[PDB]
Amino acid sequence: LFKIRMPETVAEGTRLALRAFSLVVAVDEHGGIGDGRSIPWNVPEDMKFFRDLTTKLRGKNVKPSPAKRNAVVMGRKTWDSIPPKFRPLPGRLNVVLSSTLTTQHLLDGLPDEEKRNLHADSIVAVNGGLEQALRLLASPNYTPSIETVYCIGGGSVYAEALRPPCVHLLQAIYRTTIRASESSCSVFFRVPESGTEAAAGIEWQRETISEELTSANGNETKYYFEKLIPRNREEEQYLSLVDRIIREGNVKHDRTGVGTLSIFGAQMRFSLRNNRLPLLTTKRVFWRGVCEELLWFLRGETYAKKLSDKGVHIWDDNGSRAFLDSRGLTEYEEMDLGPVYGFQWRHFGAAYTHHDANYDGQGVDQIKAIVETLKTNPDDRRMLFTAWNPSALPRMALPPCHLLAQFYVSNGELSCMLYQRSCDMGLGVPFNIASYALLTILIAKATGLRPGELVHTLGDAHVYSNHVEPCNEQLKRVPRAFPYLVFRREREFLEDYEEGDMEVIDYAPYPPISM
Amino acid sequence: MSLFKIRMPETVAEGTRLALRAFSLVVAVDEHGGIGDGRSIPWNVPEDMKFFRDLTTKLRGKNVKPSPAKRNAVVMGRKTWDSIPPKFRPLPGRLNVVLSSTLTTQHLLDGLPDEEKRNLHADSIVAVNGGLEQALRLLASPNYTPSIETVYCIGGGSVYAEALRPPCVHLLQAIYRTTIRASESSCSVFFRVPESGTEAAAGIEWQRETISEELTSANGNETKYYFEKLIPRNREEEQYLSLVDRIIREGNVKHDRTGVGTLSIFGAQMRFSLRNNRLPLLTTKRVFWRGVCEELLWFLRGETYAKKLSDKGVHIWDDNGSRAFLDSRGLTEYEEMDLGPVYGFQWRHFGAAYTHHDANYDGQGVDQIKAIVETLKTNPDDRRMLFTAWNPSALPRMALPPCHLLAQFYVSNGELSCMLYQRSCDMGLGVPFNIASYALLTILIAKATGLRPGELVHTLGDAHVYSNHVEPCNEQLKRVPRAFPYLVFRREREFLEDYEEGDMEVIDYAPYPPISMK
Ligand SMILES: NC(=O)C1=CN([C@@H]2O[C@H](COP(=O)(O)OP(=O)(O)OC[C@H]3O[C@@H](n4cnc5c(N)ncnc54)[C@H](OP(=O)(O)O)[C@@H]3O)[C@@H](O)[C@H]2O)C=CC1
Ligand SMILES: NC(=O)C1=CN([C@@H]2O[C@H](COP(=O)(O)OP(=O)(O)OC[C@H]3O[C@@H](n4cnc5c(N)ncnc54)[C@H](OP(=O)(O)O)[C@@H]3O)[C@@H](O)[C@H]2O)C=CC1
Ligand SMILES: Nc1nc(N)c2c(OCCCOc3cccc(F)c3)cccc2n1
Ligand SMILES: Nc1nc(N)c2c(OCCCOc3cccc(F)c3)cccc2n1
C-alpha cells in the first residue's frame, strides 16, 4: 500500500543475454594460428601462461571449485587437439562446442573411468557456437559461479568472438606471438582495426606488450605477450576531468586547513545498457557500500546504524553524538541523521522527530510518483525527485551532495540525470556514479523499462590536496572494460530488495594505488 | 522591509562599469595589404567611398536618420583627420572622435573654415589625447554610452595596429575590409588580420561572415575590388547551434496528449562568459530582452502575480495565468494572473504558505537569495550556495512547475560563476531567454556581493525542438554567430529589489534579421 510493487516484467528487464568473456590465443610472426589439428611449435613459457591465466581466480586465496572456478570455451576440434591425458583441462569447466559430440560422448573418450566421473561436472558441450555457449554461461547455474570465461580455441570460434554480437562482450584479448616461422597455420588471427566497420565501434588497444623473450626449451624461440582491451571512453571522461582539475584547478584552502583543487561545472555520460555497470576500473569502488546505502535511500531510511551494522561506515563521522550536537540536533539519538536523503525522497517535507516514528503516508513520495508516471506517460518532463529541501536542511545531520535527479524515456530505455552540488573526485564521484546506475536500473525493473544512460552533472568538482600524487598514479592506468550487474533473484516490492540479490560480475579493477 | 530587502554594497558600481566600448573597424587595402604610403590613399574607388559613408553613418533599423541623441561615432588618428578635406570636415552624421597628443578639441575646431562652421559642429567633434584605447574608454562614458550606437575605427596605420592587438582587439565586433586592385601602388603600411592559432590572434578566430564577388568599379579605369566582413568566431553561441542541430538530426520524436510533437535529446551543458560586461544574448535570432530583464527582476522581487508583467507589455505568462488554465489545474480560488507560489516565491519564501498574491509574505519561508548573498560575501568557497524552486509540496499549488528549478553559485578569483539546472528546455524560444535570465541574475548577484561576473554554465535536461520550429530552426543554423553585446547600468539602487529594467541597457547587439518563414 505504501511500498512500490514490482511489475510482472521485473526480471525480463535485466536478464543477462550473454556472459562477457576474455580470449586467449597464440600466433606466429605471420598472424597464423595452426592448421586444422595441431600447434607444431611448443613454448613452455606460453603453455604455463595459458595454464595460469585460464585457471587462477583473482581472489588470491581461493582454489577453483564447482562453486567458483573459471571456464574455458573451445571448439570440438580444439578439444580433440588436447592430449587425451590433459583432458578435460584441470580446474576449469570445459565447454566444448559441437553439433555432434554430446556431454556423455566427450566424457567417454576418457581412459580411467575414475575421472569419467570426477570429470562429470567438468565437461559440458553445446550444440552451437560461442554465442550459444556465452548464452548458456549467462544462466544462474554458471553466473556468477563461473568467475571468468576464456574462449581458448578454434579459428572458427575466434572469428565469431571477433564479430558482433559476441565482440561487444569481449573483455580482453591475450595474444602470444611465437616468432617461429611456420606455414602450418592457414587461418590468420586479426584483431579488428580501429575505425573500420569490423570493429563495430570498438577500439582495440594494447594494455601491455612485453619485450622479446626466449624460451628455455633449447630452441632460442623468440616470443612475446600482448593484452589488448576495448578502449573505455566513458571511464576516460572521469580521468580527463580529474587530470584537468589537478592541472588547472583552483586551489582553495579550508578553515580547517583542508586543501582542494577544483573547477565548476562538468558533465559525464554512462551506458547502463545490456547489464553494464559503470564501476570504474582504475581504482576499485566499494560496491557493497553503494548497494547497501542506495537500498537504504530507497526505503527512506534515516538511521545510519543500519549501514553500520552492515560494514558500511560511510555515515559514522556525521552520526557521532558530538557532530549531531554541534548541529543542535541534541534530541537525535546517536546515528539518527535526521530527514536526510531517502526521507525527502519518500517523504518530502514530512515533520521529523525521530527515526523511530512511522512515516508511511507522510510527506510527498516523489519516487512512488516517478514510478507511476514512468508507466503511464514516460514522456512527462517533471519526473525528478529532490532531497534539497531548504526548510528541512537545518534538521539534517547534513545537506545532501547528490541533491537532484530527473528521468527520461525514449524507445523503452530509462535514462537518469544526476545533479551533484559538490563532488570529491577521489572517493565520492566513482561511488555516486555507482549509486545512480544502480538506482536507475532498479527504477527501470520497477517500471517495465530497460536501463539506458546515467548523466552526471557536477557542480563543484574537486580533487583533495593530498590526492594529487595518488590520483596521478591512477591517472596513469588505462581504463579497462566495465563489469556487469545481474540479479540472482527478485522481490515483489522495490523496498524489499537486498544486497544479496544482485551480483557484480567480471569486474577486474587494477591494484590499490601503490602509495 | 529593508532588512527584508538586499542592500547593495558600496562597490555596487565598481564591478560592472564598462572600461572599453565595443567597436567595428572599416578599412581599405590594395592586393598586397597596403593601406597607403603614410602620405595618402593613392586610390579612390567610388563604390567603396559610398560603402564607407553609409556603413559609418546609417543606424540599425532604417527609417531613422542620425541625431545628437542617437548617432554612430568614428575614431581616427590626427593625420587621417588632417587628410579629410577641411571642407567636408567633419564627416557628417557621426561623432568625429580624433586621437591627437598635440591638438585639443578646441584646436580641431579652430581648424574649420569659419566661426559658423565651428558652432554647428561643436558637439560633433571631440579630441582624445591618447590611443584607440583611450578613445574607447571615453566612448564608454555615460555621455556616449549607450547614446552612440556603433563605434567605427575609420583609420590610421597607428590606429589599426592598436585596434588589432590586445586589449582593444577583444572589443572588435567586426572588421570591414575592402580590397582594391591598386596597380603598382607599393605603399608601406600593411593591414594584416592575425591568423587562427597564432599568438598575435590572441585566441581570436577571425572568419568571414561575408565576401563579395570580384566587383568592377564603374569609375574610370574599372579598378577591380571586393568586400569582406570578418568577425570573431563565437564558439559559445555555436554551442547552442550545434545542440539544436543535433536535436533535429538525431533527437527523439514525441507527441503528447495535446498532440504537440517535438524532437529531443536528454542531458547537455553549455558555457557562457559574463566577464567584462559581456551578455550572452543570442545573435542568430533576436532575444526578447526587455521581457527577460522584466521577468528576472520579477523573480527576484518574489512576485507571483503575472499581471505586473502584462501591464508592462510582457505576456510570457498570459497563457499560464489565465482563468481557464488556472482552473484546469484546480486553482479555482486563484484570481486571474495569480500564478501562486511559483519561481521567485520559492526563491524568497521557500516553504512559506500561500493564499493570494497580494498577501504579505515578508519574513515568511526561507529567503534563499538573501542567504546566498550573505555567504558569497563572507565564505565565498562554501559548497552549498544554491537556491531551488523545485518544491514538491507547493508544486500542486503553482500554476505549473519551474522549468529553471535550480541554480548554484561558485567563486574563484573574485569572479562569481553560476550553474543552472533546467528540466524542460525549448531550444527555439525557451533556451535563449533563460541563458539571458541567468546571465542577468549572475550579474546582479555579483553586484550585490562585491564580485565580478564570471561564467554561466547551463545544464539542460529534456532539450527539444518543436516540429513547427524544425524548418526555421534550420534556416537559423545557416547563420554564423556574431560577437555578443554588452550590459551597462545607467543607474544603481539601494537595494537589489529596487532595480528596474530602465536602470540598464544592452549595447552593440547586432542580431540577424527575422526569419523568412511565417
Ligand atoms: N596455437 C594456438 O594457440 C591455438 C591453436 N588452435 C588450433 O586450431 C585448430 C582448431 O581450429 P578449427 O579448425 O577452427 O576448429 P575448432 O577447434 O574451432 O572446432 C570447430 C568445430 O567446433 C564445432 N563448432 C564451431 N562452431 C559451431 C557452431 N556454431 N555450432 C555447432 N558446432 C560448432 C564443430 O564441431 P562438430 O563439427 O563436431 O559439430 C566444428 O567443426 C587446431 O589445430 C587447434 O590445435 C586452437 C586454439 C589455439
Ligand atoms: N586606405 C584607407 O582605408 C586608409 C588610409 N589612411 C591613410 O594613412 C595615412 C595616415 O596613417 P598614419 O600616418 O599611421 O596616421 P594616423 O591617421 O594613425 O594618425 C597618427 C596620429 O594619431 C595620433 N595618435 C595615434 N596613436 C596615439 C596615441 N597612442 N597617443 C596619442 N596620439 C596618438 C597622433 O596625433 P599627433 O600627431 O597629434 O601626436 C598621431 O601622430 C594617411 O595618408 C591616410 O590617407 C588612413 C585611414 C584609412
Ligand atoms: N596463448 C595461448 N593460448 C592458447 N589458447 C593456447 C593453446 O590452446 C589450445 C587449446 C588446447 O589446449 C591445450 C592445453 C594443454 C596442452 C595442449 F597440447 C593443448 C595451446 C597451446 C598454447 C596456447 N597459448
Ligand atoms: N574600405 C574603406 N575603409 C575606409 N576606412 C575608408 C575611409 O576611411 C576614412 C578615413 C579617412 O576619411 C576620408 C573621408 C573622406 C575623404 C578622404 F580623403 C578621407 C575613407 C574612404 C574610403 C574607405 N574605404
A69 is in an annotated binding site: no
A365 within 8 A of A346, measured Cβ to Cβ = yes
Q: Which domain holds residue B293?
A: 236-518
Domains identified in chain A, total number = 2
Residue B457 to chain A, least CA–CA distance (Å): 6
Q: How far is the CA of B130 from the centre of ligand 2 (A)?
A: 12
Q: How far is B393 from chain A (nearest CA, A)?
A: 7
Location of C-alpha cell 486571474: B336
Q: At what angle do helices B289-301 and B430-447 cross, to 10 degrees?
A: 50
Cα–Cα distance between A243 and B217 in angstroms, integer? 58
Report the relative pairing of strands A213-214 and A222-224 from DSSP bridges: antiparallel
From chain A, the residues in CB contact with B381 under 8 A are 252
Q: Which of B419, B422, B426, B457 has the highest number of chain A CBs within 10 A, making it the mutation to test binding with A?
A: B419
Tell me, using a 6 A CB cutoff, whether residue A452 lines ligand 1: no
Sequence-separated (6 or more) residues with CB below 8 Å from residue B332: B326
Question: How far apart are the C-alpha atoms of B127 and B90, rounded to whole Å?
Answer: 12
Euclidean distance between CA atoms A334 and A316, whole angstroms: 10
CA distance A383 to A372: 10
Q: Which ligand is nearest to the CA of A47?
A: 3
Report how far residue B59's alpha carbon sits from residue A3's, in angstroms, rounded to the nearest whole number: 67
Residue labelled with grid coordinates 591598386 = B182
Closest partner residue to A252 among B269, B381, B388, by Cβ? B381
DSSP for B45-112, written as a single string: -HHHHHHHHHHHH--SSSS---BTTBEEEEEEEHHHHHTS-TTS-S-TTEEEEEE-SS--HHHHHHTS
Measured between alpha carbons, how far is A260 from A250 in angstroms, rounded to an integer?
A: 8
Measured in angstroms, the CA of B164 and the nearest CA of chain A are apart by 29
Q: Least CA distance to B416: which residue of chain A?
A: A264
Question: Is A402 within any annotated ligand binding site?
Answer: yes
Within 13 Å and on the Cβ side, how many CA atoms surround B50?
5
Cβ of A13 below 6 Å from ligand 1: no
Distance CA B481, CA A215 (A): 65
Contact (CB, 8 A) for B307 and B318: no
Phi, psi of B504 (to 5 degrees): -140, 160
Q: Answer yes or no: are the C-beta atoms of A286 and A278 closer than 8 Å.
A: no
Number of C-beta neighbours around residue B220 at 10 A: 7
Query: In angstroms, what CA-CA distances link A266 with A60, A240, A464?
Result: 38, 11, 17
> Residue B267 and residue A388: Cβ atoms within 8 Å?
no
d(CA B171, CA A463): 36
User: Side chain identity at B193, as an amino acid letter?
Assistant: V
User: Nearest by CB to A421, which of B384, B390, B417?
Assistant: B384
- Residues of A with a Cβ under 8 Å from any B Cβ are 250, 252, 264-267, 269, 348-349, 364, 366, 379, 381-382, 384-386, 388-391, 399, 404, 406, 408, 410-411, 415, 417, 419, 421-422, 453, 455, 457, 459-460
The distance of B423 to chain A (nearest Cα, Å) reads 7
Ligand nearest to the CA of B29: 2
Residues A304/A324, Cβ–Cβ less than 8 Å: no
| Residues β-bridged to residue A504 | A485
CB–CB contact B421 A386 (8 Å): no
Do A207 and A295 share a structural domain? no
Any residues with CB less than 8 A from the CB of B427 and at least 6 apart, and which?
Answer: B240, B243, B244, B247, B463, B464, B465, B469, B473
Nearest to A92 by CA among A59, A131, A57, A64: A64
CATH value at residue B446: 3.30.572.10
Residue A392 grid coordinates: 528541512
Q: Which of A47, A55, A78 to mutate to test the pocket of ligand 3 (most atoms within 8 A of CB)?
A: A47
Strand partners, A415: A408
Q: Relative to the alpha carbon of B30, which ligand is closest?
A: 2
Q: What is the dihedral of CA B431, B436, B441, B447, to 10 degrees?
A: 150
CA separation for the pair B192, B33 (Å, rounded): 7
Q: Assign residue A151 the CATH number of its domain.
A: 3.40.430.10
Which residue in chain B is spatially nearest to A423 when comparing CA positions? B383
Please state whether beta strands A204-209 and B148-155 pair in parallel, antiparallel, or not at all (unpaired).
unpaired
Give the residue carrying C-alpha cell 512527462.
A380
Question: Residues B407, B419: contact at Cβ < 8 Å?
Answer: yes
- The finding on whether A78 has its CB within 6 A of some atom of ligand 1 is yes
> DSSP states of A106-125 as a string?
HHHT-S-TTHHHHTSSSEEE
Residue B143 CB burial class (10 angstroms; 0-12, 13-18, ≥19): exposed
Resolution in A: 2.8
Q: Which of B212, B235, B258 is the endpoint of a domain?
A: B235
Measured distance CA(A260)–CA(A282) in Å, rounded: 21
Distances (CA, A) of B397 to B331, B394, B418: 7, 5, 28
For residue B238, count CB atoms less than 10 angstroms from its CB and return exposed for 0-12, middle for 13-18, buried for 19 or more. middle
The conformation of residue A455, written as its DSSP 8-state character, comes to: E
The CA distance from B427 to B246, in Å, is: 11
Chain A closest CA to B465's CA: distance in Å? 14
Adjacent-strand bridge partners of B424: B462
Q: Which residue spans within A184-339 are E strands per DSSP?
A: 204-209, 213-214, 222-224, 226-230, 250-253, 259-271
Provide φ and ψ at A361, rounded to 5°.
80, -30
- Contact assignment for A264 to B410 by CB distance below 8 Å: yes
Contacts of B93 (CB under 8 A, 6+ apart): B57, B65, B66, B71, B72
Strands A450-464 and A413-424 turn out to be parallel
For residue B90, say if its preceding peptide bond is cis, omega within 30 degrees of 0: yes
Report d(CA A490, CA A9) in Å as an integer.
Answer: 11
Inter-chain touch B393–A349, beta carbons under 8 Å = yes
Q: DSSP secondary structure string, B167-178?
A: TGGGGEEEEEEE
Whole-angstrom Cα Rg for chain A:
26
Pairwise CA distance, residues B57 & B64, whole Å = 11
**Among candidates B508, B511, B440, which has minimal Cα distance to B139?**
B508
Chain centre distance of CA A369? 29
b/e per residue, B56-80, with b = 16+ CB within 10 A? bbbbeeeeeebeeeebbbbbbbbbb
Strands (E), A159-212: 170-179, 204-209
Distance CA B345, CA A331 (A): 32
CA-to-CA dists, residue B433 to A12, A234, A457, B417, B512, angstroms? 44, 32, 22, 18, 16
Tell me the catalytic residues of A.
Answer: 401
Let me know whether B214 and B157 are in one domain: yes
Non-local (6+) Cβ contacts of A372 within 8 A are: none
Report CB contact under 8 Å: A264, B412.
yes
Mark whether B153 is an active-site residue: no
User: Mutate which of A49, A51, A152 to test ligand 3's pocket (most atoms within 8 Å of Cβ)?
Assistant: A152
Report the distance separating Cα B343 and Cα B304, nearest Å. Answer: 8
Task: Please answer yes or no on whether A379 and B254 come within 8 Å at the CB atom.
Answer: yes
Nearest chain B alpha carbon to A412: B252
Would you give the DSSP letter of residue B511?
A: P
From B211, B235, B259, the end of a domain falls on B235
What is the rounded CA–CA span in Å between residue A214 and residue A222? 5
Spatial CB neighbours of B52, under 8 Å, sequence gap ≥ 6? B26, B28, B154
Query: DSSP class of residue A128?
Result: S
**DSSP alpha helices (H): ranges in B457-509?**
472-478
N-term to C-term CA, chain B: 48
Q: The sheet that has B415-426: what strands, in order across it?
A: B252-255, B261-273, B452-466, B415-426, B404-412, B386-388
The C-alpha atoms of residue B276 and residue B289 are separated, in whole angstroms, by 19
Residue of A nearest to B252 (CA): A410
Sheet holding A259-271, edge to edge: A250-253, A259-271, A450-464, A413-424, A402-410, A384-386
Tell me the CA distances in angstroms from A92 to A49, A50, A70, A74, B270, one per residue in order.
15, 12, 5, 12, 52
The C-alpha atoms of residue A26 and residue A46 are separated, in whole angstroms, by 8
B85: cell is: 578635406
Indicate if ligand 3 lies below 6 Å from the C-beta of A82. Answer: yes
Do A131 and A263 belong together in one domain? no
Task: Give dist(CA B240, CA B499) in Å, integer.
Answer: 30
CA of A123 to the centre of ligand 1 (A): 16
CA of A78 to the centre of ligand 3 (A): 9
Whether the CB-CB separation of A53 and A207 falls below 8 Å is answered with no
On whether both B203 and B342 belong to a single domain, the answer is: no
Matching residue, cell 574610370: B220
Q: Does the Cβ of A176 fall within 6 Å of ligand 3?
A: yes
Let me know whether A216 and A241 are in one domain.
Answer: no
Residue A37 CB less than 6 A away from ligand 1: yes
CA B149 to chain centre: 13
User: Same domain for A17 and A159?
Assistant: yes
Query: What residues does A509 pair with on adjacent strands?
Result: none
**Contact call for A349 and B410, based on CB within 8 A:** no
Residue whose entry in the numeric block shows the C-alpha cell 588436447:
A82
Q: Cα(A39)–Cα(A27) distance, rounded to whole angstroms?
A: 10
CA A102 remoteness from chain centre: 34
Main-chain phi, psi angles of A322, to 5 degrees: -65, -60
C-alpha A489: how far from chain center: 18
One-letter amino acid identity for A39? I
Residue (of A416, A455, A449, A378) closest to A9 by Cα position: A449
Q: Are residues B315 and B184 in the same domain?
A: no
Q: Are residues B80 and B179 in the same domain?
A: yes
Nearest atom within ligand 4 for CA of residue B40: 18
In this complex, do A388 and B383 lie within 8 Å of one another by their Cβ atoms? no
Distance (Å) from the C-alpha of residue B397 to the closest C-alpha of chain A?
14
**If you measure from the C-alpha of residue B158 to the centroid of ligand 2, how many angstroms do you get, rounded to a whole number?**
5
* Active-site entry in B168, B403, B418, B473: B403
Is residue A235 helix, strand or coil? helix
Q: Which of B366, B422, B462, B466 to mutate to test the interface with A (most CBs of A within 10 A)?
A: B462
Report the chain B residue with the minimal C-alpha distance to residue A383: B423
Whether the CA torsion A382, A388, A389, A392 is positive or negative: it is positive
- In the A/B pair of chains, how many CB contacts fall below 8 A? 106
Q: Tell me which DSSP letter residue B409 carries.
A: E
CA distances from A389 to A513, B351, B372 (A): 38, 9, 15
Instruction: Report the candidate in B147, B64, B132, B62 with the shortest Cα–Cα distance to residue B97.
Output: B132
Both B219 and B252 in a single domain?
no
- Where does a domain end: A233, A248, A283? A233
Indicate which technique resolved this structure.
Answer: X-ray
d(CA B267, CA A29): 48
Q: Is B314 in the pocket of ligand 2 (CB under 6 A)?
A: no
The x, y and z cell numbers of residue A134, run together, are 556465452
**Bridge partner list, A404:** A386, A419
- For residue B421, give the nearest of A348, A411, A419 by CB distance: A419
Query: In which residue are the cell numbers 564577388 written?
Result: B213
Neighbours of A290 (CB within 10 A): 26
CA of B162 from ligand 4 middle (Å) equals 18
Nearest-CA neighbor of B412 among A249, A188, A280? A249
Counting atoms of ligand 2 from 1, which one is nearest the CA of B37? 43
Same domain, A328 and A391: yes
Residue B390 backbone phi and psi in degrees, to 5: -90, 90
CB A225, CB A49: distance < 8 Å: yes
Grid cell digits, residue B402: 519551474
Largest Cα span, chain B: 83
Q: Do B459 and A419 touch (CB under 8 A)?
A: yes
- In this structure, what C-alpha cell is assigned to residue B198? 597564432
Q: Do B234 and B482 form a contact (C-beta atoms < 8 A)? A: yes
Q: What share of chain A is helix, strand, coil (3-state, %, to 5)?
A: 30, 25, 45
The angle at the Cα of A16, spanning A14 to A20, to the nearest 5 degrees, equals 135
User: Grid coordinates 512511522 are at which residue?
Assistant: A358
Residues B242 and B192 in one domain: no
Q: Are residues A185 and A86 in the same domain?
A: yes
Taking the C-alpha atoms of residue A47 and residue B415, their distance in angstroms, rounded to an integer, is: 63
- Grid cell for residue B11: 562597490
**How many other CB atoms sit within 10 Å of the CB of residue A352?**
23
Cβ within 8 Å of residue A383, ≥6 positions away: A370, A373, A374, A406, A407, A408
